[PDB]
Amino acid sequence: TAEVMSHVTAHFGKTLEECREESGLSVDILDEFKHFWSDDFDVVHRELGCAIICMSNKFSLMDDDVRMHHVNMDEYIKSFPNGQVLAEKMVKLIHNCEKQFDTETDDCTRVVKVAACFKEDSRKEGIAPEVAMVEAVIEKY
Ligand SMILES: CCC/C=C\C=C\CCCCCCCCC=O
Ligand SMILES: [Mg+2]
Ligand SMILES: [Mg+2]
Ligand SMILES: [Mg+2]
Ligand SMILES: [Mg+2]
């Protein structure tokens, strides 16, 4: 649901600053990770894909194939309030998006394409949070 997705994003997003230098992700491409969800942010830069790899690996959310680690992702989503309602759904959406981009050989590019797909499918499924909802939870933890 959109509130669980707001907690997930608020917490995950706290690793963006430490990942900027190695990914090339300028503040002028993305200032705060919560903007990922804005109507006006296009999820397209290779550098954002490199950043997401950096951020994921902090939490062991990717496996050694630079794809989502399903078990660690399920445990991560369950770590938030009401996480059990989102965990299986989110893992399903991300992995369906992964399958569409398997043929992309550049890991950074692949990951940003998966991320755009995930944003799209989350919006479609009604679980995409608004930027304001993410901001409302930024203080936590
Ligand atoms: C690894 C998933 C990132 C964890 C939580 C989600 C945060 C909000 C949006 C980030 C999109 C991540 C797309 C997964 C990419 C997998 O190839
Ligand atoms: Mg840190
Ligand atoms: Mg680099
Ligand atoms: Mg790892
Ligand atoms: Mg390349």
Q: Which CATH number belongs to the domain containing residue 49 in this structure?
A: 1.10.238.20
State the total domains in the chain: 1
Number of H helices, E strands in the chain: 7, 0
**Ligand 1 lining (C-beta closer than 6 Å):** 8-9, 12, 36, 52, 56, 61, 67-68, 94, 98, 111, 114-115, 118
Residue closest via CA to ligand 1's atom 4 equals 12
* Cβ neighbours for 63, distance < 8 A, ≥ 6 positions apart: 69
Domain range for residue 80? Answer: 1-141
How many whole angstroms separate alpha carbon 73 and alpha carbon 66?
13
d(CA 28, CA 117) in angstroms, rounded, equals 22
Opening angle at CA 124, ends 136 and 41, nearest 5: 55
Instruction: Give the residue from 45, 15, 1, 3 showing the smallest Cα distance to 135.
Output: 3
Q: Are 99 and 93 in contact (CB under 8 A)?
A: no
| Number of the ligand 1 atom closest to the C-alpha atom of 56 | 1
Give the span between the Cα atoms of 41 and 39, in whole angstroms.
6
Q: Choose the residue to mutate in 5, 43, 86, 94 for probing ligand 1, maximizing ligand atoms within 8 Å of C-beta.
A: 94
Q: Are 45 and 112 in contact (CB under 8 A)?
A: yes
Instruction: Give the single-character DSSP code of 129.
Output: P
How far, in Å, CA of 131 to CA of 125, rounded?
Answer: 17
Residues ≥6 apart with Cβ < 8 Å to 13 = 32, 33, 34, 36, 55, 134
Q: Where are the beta strands (DSSP E) in 79-131?
A: none
Strand partners, 62: 68
**How many Cβ atoms sit within 10 Å of the Cβ of residue 65?**
9
Question: What gap in Å lies between CA 55 and CA 88, rounded to an integer?
Answer: 21
Contact 59, 80 (CB under 8 A): no
**Rounded Cα–Cα distance for residues 27 and 34 (Å):** 13
CA of 63 to the centre of ligand 4 (A): 6
Q: What is the DSSP letter of 31?
A: S
